[PDB]
Structures are given as structure tokens and as C-alpha cells.
Structure 1
């Protein structure tokens, strides 16, 4: 993925402090794995995945939406089990806003309906024969100003001769203007082709002209202007003997400075082979045409974007059954391809258990788990939001992301303020026995908890823990995947001259022994491993016992005298 935002350039060393209603929010904690999310979200590039390490970046780029709330749940659900790093992509295919005034085509780095609230305009600076720019993004209150735009340096001819003329030629094939010739009294001193080579930069031209005993080229102090020579503007017969002759690169100066604006991009309008529409001052005018578009009917293309990213957990912020099928098919493809993943899903408000069974009937896959409960969460700024299940799914996903590989989410507490429905003991049993993960409520003397009763996937059979309990299957997944990638490097990747089946067997046993020494695996059979080699291919087979968690306790009391 792409970490979108690099540093802001700074100007002065200082410490500034400002009161506010809200702070920087959460932060991504250290994690073995990564958490992928997709949802409605304002800001950012559509069909592009962004990596987030802090809530500040999420605010700065994913400017608003339920997605940003989901990130808050991921890191705010539990400080101890804070969720790890994040990969995010907005479902909405937003559009940029555009303005085409004053010889300039102006477009928004922002995508969405917000983009139409951007205003940009040029102004004429009579003081130095120059153009002036102002950029205001009203929603973020971001104001920018540039002045003396285009004027690089001034030339004076000091001799007594009658006339000194400055000329610049134009190439119509490419629309460039790449010559600069100084003539005095119908005689020429030098000519500088601005097509690279001898005079690629204006710096050399200034040095060249200054060497001429009868001329002086002097640098304008208002803004760094060391532009390449090819960016100089069309100039025709300017009298050098006069008070001041300006050398101009209006777009070149704009091109450099405006690259640092945080809101805008600039293009030079070609007339509608058509010559250039002159860049001229114009009123500060709104950009237009920026919209959010519509979401696609199918999210398969979006999911395919996450292939080869390593995000074990993926959560779609939706309740659509078809979307769930798309993810399940996608996860199935990646798991066979060599990229294991798990999907967490939950739909609607207070949905009927029969409808939950309807989803279970339609979908029975160990790679996915279905959450049933819907509730409300208290979040930053004191606002409490009542939300569907797929937001609860994020809390489960954020929790599972923070937990270690060998530890299940089973029975762990949750911070959710309240739930729509309080399932009974029998109600909970029916869900769990049918492969539905739910939340349980308990009350202390003066405390209340919401707990995750157990780990269960949509797959119903209790025969095989790896199929049923995602925690067990996850432990197997990371074990094998980490092993194979290491094995690929040693033998396939690294140049190996020779190899035998027994050598592979020893390496495997060495790997497993290390895991036990790290407590990642409790026990295993050493003699069960099998290795077969056939030309350029090898087959490896082995078994490891899954970890077993503590589930049931039964107690009885007897009262007696004395």
C-alpha cells in the first residue's frame, strides 16, 4: 500500500500550543498482522489503498465517514489489545472538481462533493508587472497566496548605442518557446537555445549575460526562480535600453510554487493544433464537477486490489449478502493462492435468529464468521452512535488483530455501551451451536461486562477445531505460511547447489522445535513428517496438534452442620 502524506516543510523553530475540544485520537500499535477495511468514506483516491499508522492521518485523508469511525473502534476498543496497522480503500468512486478560467485549467487534489467548495483566482500585481495567486479552501479554512509570479530577472543594456532589443522565438510543433537572443543596433552578441545543452538553466544565461560588458541580468528576490530555460515565455522585441526588461516564465513559476499547494493542481489551457490560451488574472471562482459518484454493484475488483498485501483480517462495512459472497470467494482464492485471510461479517439491526440461520444456510465457510449482535458505541467528542453489526465486526476484527496468534478472542471483554437485544442462555446456545458468534452480558456487584462467548466460524461441524475455531486455524495458518516463505528463501530463492529429502526433514524439525521453545505450539509428533522429492518438485506432509482452550466447569455445593 501507499503511506500517502509526507512531511510538511517547515519555516521556523518554535513551540506552539493551542486549546481544542478534541485531540489527535488513537494510534496504531505494534502488531504481527494488518487489518483491511472498505467502506463509505469522504476523501482519498478511489480504487486506491492507503496505509494508516495514526488516527491523524485517517482524519487528514479519510476526512469523514463511517470508515473513519471504524478505525476509531479498532484502536479504541481496548488499550491492551489495540488494533494494529490499517489498510483502507473508499468504496465511493468520487470525482475531482475543475475550473478553467484565465488560461488555466484548475483541478482538485480532493475527490468528492467537497471539491466544489474550492476557490482559486489570479490577480494582477501592477507594482512589478506580475501576476498574483490566491488559493482558499473554505471548508478546511486553508488560505494560500503567491506574489510576483512569473518574473525571474531583469536585463539592462548600459551602452550608448541607439537601440537594444530582446527577442524570444516560438516553436509551433510543440508549442514551446526555446530561444533568447540579445541584439543591439542590428548586431547580435549571443543566442541561447532553451532546449537543453548549453543553457539548460536560466542560471547559466544570467551568468552568460552578466559576462557581457554592456549588459547586466539581476535576480528577482521575490521567490526562488532557478527554472529551466525551456520554461521562459514568448517575448518579442523588448527594448533592453529601457528602465527594466523582464524575463518571464508565468507557468514555470506557477508550476514550481503551486506544486506545494495542498489543494490544487494547475494546467495550461490549450485553446479549443491550437495555440495557448493566455494565462491572465481572473476572479476567485469555485471549482465544479466534483462528486462522490456511486458505489459499484460488485466489490470484486476492489477486493482484488488487496491481493499481495498481507492483511490477514478483512472486514467489509456492509450487510449485503452478495457482497459477503464476493469476499468469501475472494478469501477462498487467496488462501489457495498462498495468502491466508479471515473475513468478519455482520448485518443489519437486531436481525432475527432465523434470518441469521438463513445467512448460515446460504453461507457455511471456515474462512468467515458471522456476528449477530448490534449495539451502540460511545466515541470521541462524547458522541454515542447506534450502529449496525458490521461496525461491531470491526471491534472483533480490531480486537483479534491486537491479540497474539496463540490467544483466542474467546471470553475477552468488550467496551460496547449497550446492545439492542439481550440473548438468554438458551438463545446464546442455539447461536453458538449453529456457528454464530455472539456477545454475552454479565453483571458484577457494581460492574457490567460484554463478553465474546466463543470463537466459531460459519462452518458448523465441531469435529475439526481448525475448521470451527478461527483462533486454532489462524495458528496453523501463520505457522505454515511463515515456514514456507522461509523455506522458499533458503532453497528456491537463495542459490542452493544440492539438497536431499532428509535435509528438508531436519530443517522442518528444527523449525518446529524452535516454536515449542517459544511456546507457540504445545506439542507435536516428531516422527509424523514425510518428505518426497520428484525431479524439480518436493512434497511435504506433517501434523501438529491444535491448542485446546478451557470451556466448561461444573460445580456442586453441600451444606452440612457443624
Structure 2
């Protein structure tokens, strides 16, 4: 919505004001768990198994990601956010004049090995990094040799000196002397001489001196980071300006696993392992860990912990997000092969609409051939992964779990008890030619079922998504716009269009169009509407009646 050109002119012409608009939720799933990699107190987006495996090297969190993506084979692999819990630190060592620190966080980082070398022919330093856990190996050759200087005059004395600012030790001057006087001095006070290229060109401009830009990779360093050479016979032999401190930034900092700094002079040293890499331990308080998911747009979050303390902290967190205008929900699972008493005690402990409990625990056949027996919360991750895979407002009732085997194959009594007490449960259906596991219900921890919005996960999800989208769109659209005479009618037509688009996608059942009434008065706009909520079948009765009938011919 801009004019062509984007420069108004008064002389006669013909302008165009094209409008490119008009030709245009994701339900992200969150995860918190354990892994041998990734920074602490940080959230990362995941879309591919390899991508997760790059950062999250190994641990239960990787297995949880694989289970969550594998929990809905018929559906796409959606966006997932992952976090590490351990307060890990990176491996680092100080050898020579350089500070060496690895990017990887944890005890794996200690296997990284770095060493500096030198090459006799080029009179240049060399760097090599080795990491034996993945057969990784890199070499940054030709450290130094940023540009040469050559002197073609017939005088006996011809040298050059680089002078540093004494207060900050920054390179301040590049002086080129003949005899006992300064023919030229590149006083680094301003101008285009801040970059070495300009210096190189102007040295080439000199009648005697000449500077060639290095063919061993164009470096183009700022003049303030150059090294210091003096009393070097430029006339007799080409003298190499090096500026290894610049080569750090040019080669080593932008690439590779290891970062480099200076505390001292850079010098060669043998390949030495880094140390100091620590995984750490999880903190007592989990509230800081959850707060990073404040603005990330995630709706479903599941920690890899059976502890009731974490469950309560997560329940308080998601409630606080919902009060703050960002509704979220969580699913948890208790231990290995826990009895019904423990499930009742956990459900009475939580009693939260925005929290669900999972009872069944079993075994999942991983893609690596592993029959990974797992606790109930991994099953809760599988249910979260399935719920995220479905559309908005859908219900995970009677859907297939796609597990391999379950520790406790319940009967009708236990499933009825768990359903009434508000605990999600899963059954191996025996009645059939071919057998599978299905989820019997999606009831929340809130026991009383008088309000299905709070009791049912699907209804509360549809309500939260509807409210959030309507609120955001109404802010984005009409606040700050003129209160013209047609505003009310425009607002009505927009809301009708939004509701009709919701109905089209089957996120809502139906609404009365006439009841969408808009009142405008002053700065306030009052709106009243009605919508019938989408519901999912959970009871079917058939009243069959037999009869007899006579036939003739």
C-alpha cells in the first residue's frame, strides 16, 4: 500500500498505488527434558530429527522428540520447542596468549582438542581443531601474511614501523621511513585509512614503496588491529605484515566449533584437550525454566519428570500464562507401573482444568530398533504430540496410541473408575480380528463435569484458540482507526466473515448471524454475539424394534 514511485512529484505524471494484500494458529508443542548438549536456560526450535540430534546429542529428550514426532504418523511433523534443564557450562582452556572456549555445553565439550602450528615456507602460523567423537577435523592455514610491502628504491635504508596507541595498545600509525626520516606516515586518525585496503592502495601509490594484497585469502583487516614489525629490510626482502589478531576474527571466530580470544601473544602450542566442561544439576526451583516459554507461542508443554513438585510448578505456570492472555495446557505421567491409589492422589493434588494426567506406561519400538520401555510421562509426551497433530478443537478420544506394549492392560472397571476420577487411560482392544491400543477419553484433572469447557480438553482448546484469535485480530484491525459512519457495519461484516471462516473449517458448529450486533458510542465499541460450540460424540444409543410383515406372491 505505497505509491509507485515512492517519491511524490508535482510535475504531470501518472502514479499507481497498488495494494498487494488480500492474496495471503500453528499449535506449537513444547518439551522440557534432559540431553547431552545445548545451552542452559535456552529454548530451541526443532523441525527434523537430524536437526535435534545436532544440538541435543543424546539423552531422554531426544527420545521424547522422536516419540512426539512418531506419535502421529498419518500427520505432518510439526514445530517443536525444546529446552535443557541442567545448568551446564562449556569447556575452556588457557594456553599461550589466547583464551580458548568451546561452543558445546557439558562434559562432552572436554574432548575437543585445539593446537597451533607454523609453516616454514610461508612463515605463517597454522590452526587445527579435532573432535574425536564425530571424527571432526578442521584446519585454518596461513595465519598472518595480511599484505606484503616491497621497496624498489636504490637507497641503503628503507624500513617501516607500526606504532601503537600507548593507552589502549591499538595500532595507531603505519610509518614508512627512508634514511632517517618519515617519507609517509598513515596516522590512523580518520578517513578511509581505517581499513587496511586503503593503506595498501596508497602504499602502491608511493613512488618507491609498494604493497600487494595477500593472495593467500583476502583479509581486509581494520588498520587498528595490525601487528608490529620494525628494522625489517624491506628493500632486500619482502616483509610480511601479519596481524594474527585480525586472522582470529577472519578465520577462527566465524567458523568452527571453538571460539578464540586473547587475554600476551599468539604463539604455537601442541594439540591440547579443553577442560572445565560441566553438565551441572537441575535447580530446586523450576519457575525460571518455564518462564522462557513466556512469548514463544506454544500451547502444549510436557516435562520429563514424574515429580509432583514439577507438576505443581508447571500447573501454576500455565495458569499464570492463561491469566496473562496466553492460554496453555500441560500433560504429565506418573512413574513406572503406578497403582490407582497414586493416580488418585496426584489428581486430587492438582485438580486443575489446564492439566491432564496419564496412567498407562509401556514400551515404544523406536526407529533404531530399540524396545525402549518408558515411564508414563513419555506416554504423556506421545499424547501431547498427537494432540498437536490434530486440528484446532479436535479430541483425542478413541484415537490409536501406536504403542508396542503396555504394563497394565486394564479392564472395564478400572477404565470406568479412572474416567470418572479424571485420569486419562488407554486400552489394548481384544475384541477383534486385528489388535491395537486406543485412548479411552481426554478428560482433564478437574473432576466435576458440569462445565464441559473446563472438563474436556477439546472444548477448552477450541474456546482458547477462538478467543485468542478474535482478540488479536480485533486489536490488529480496528483499534486506532476512524470512527466513521460505516464503522459499525464494517465491524459486523468482519466478525461475520471471521465466524463464517471458523464454521467453514469446522472449528465451531454454527452461529446465528443476526445476533452479531455492533454498537458504537464514543471511543468504546460494544459487541454481542452467540456461537454454538463444537462437540464430540461420546455416547450413542440405538432403540431397535422388530416387526413382522406378510407377503403375497
Aligned pair count reads: 549
Distance 2:110 2:2 in 1: 26
Q: 1:213 aligns with which of 207, 210, 213?
A: 207
* Cα pair 1:34 1:313 within 8 Å, conserved: yes
Distance 1:78 1:281 in 2: 54
Distance 1:511 1:112, change over 3 A: same
* Cα pair 1:82 1:399 within 8 Å, conserved: no
Shift of 1:236: 2.6
Over residues 128-155 of structure 1, what are the superposed CA-to-partner deviations in whole Å (9 max), with x where a residue is unaligned?
A: 2221111111112211112220111222
Shift of 1:440: 1.1
Distance 1:303 1:555, change over 3 A: same
Q: Give TM-score, length-normalised by structure 2.
A: 0.89
Distance 1:459 1:257 in 2: 58
Q: Give TM-score, length-normalised by structure 1.
A: 0.88
Distance 1:234 1:9 in 2: 55
Unpaired stretches in structure 1, ≥5 consecutive residues: 25-29, 270-276
Distance 1:384 1:467, change over 3 A: same
Of 73-82 and 191-200, deviating more is 191-200
Distance 1:388 1:128, change over 3 A: same
Distance 1:3 1:53 in 2: 36
Shift of 1:194: 3.8
Distance 1:18 1:67 in 2: 52
Distance 1:499 1:18 in 2: 23
Shift of 1:161: 0.8
Shift of 1:406: 3.4
- Determine the structure 2 residue equivalent to 1:403: 390
Q: Work out whether 1:305 is the aligned partner of 2:304.
A: no
* Cα pair 2:4 2:17 within 8 Å, conserved: no
Over residues 11-43 of structure 1, what are the superposed CA-to-partner deviations in whole Å (9 max), with x where a residue is unaligned?
A: 99999999999999xxxxx98311111111121
Distance 1:521 1:560, change over 3 A: closer
Distance 1:434 1:15 in 2: 73
Of 210-219 and 488-497, deviating more is 488-497
Distance 1:6 1:188, change over 3 A: farther
* Cα pair 1:105 1:268 within 8 Å, conserved: yes
- Determine the structure 2 residue equivalent to 1:433: 420
Distance 1:284 1:20 in 2: 61
SS at match of 2:18: coil
* Cα pair 1:83 1:398 within 8 Å, conserved: no
Distance 2:19 2:110 in 1: 28
Distance 1:6 1:473 in 2: 50
SS at match of 1:21: coil
Distance 1:19 1:96 in 2: 53
Distance 1:5 1:89 in 2: 47
Distance 1:329 1:535, change over 3 A: farther
Distance 1:177 1:505, change over 3 A: same
Shift of 1:445: 4.7
Shift of 1:216: 2.2
Distance 2:490 2:222 in 1: 62
- Determine the structure 2 residue equivalent to 1:10: 9
* Cα pair 2:447 2:455 within 8 Å, conserved: yes
Distance 1:70 1:251, change over 3 A: same
- Determine the structure 2 residue equivalent to 1:261: 255
Shift of 1:548: 2.7
Distance 2:216 2:534 in 1: 70
Distance 1:248 1:174 in 2: 20
Unpaired stretches in structure 2, ≥5 consecutive residues: none
Distance 1:109 1:5 in 2: 48
SS at match of 2:394: coil
Distance 1:11 1:92 in 2: 65
Distance 1:114 1:22 in 2: 50
Distance 1:245 1:51, change over 3 A: same
SS at match of 1:521: coil
Shift of 1:10: 47
Q: Work out whether 1:108 is the aligned partner of 2:102.
A: yes
Shift of 1:3: 32
Distance 1:374 1:413 in 2: 15
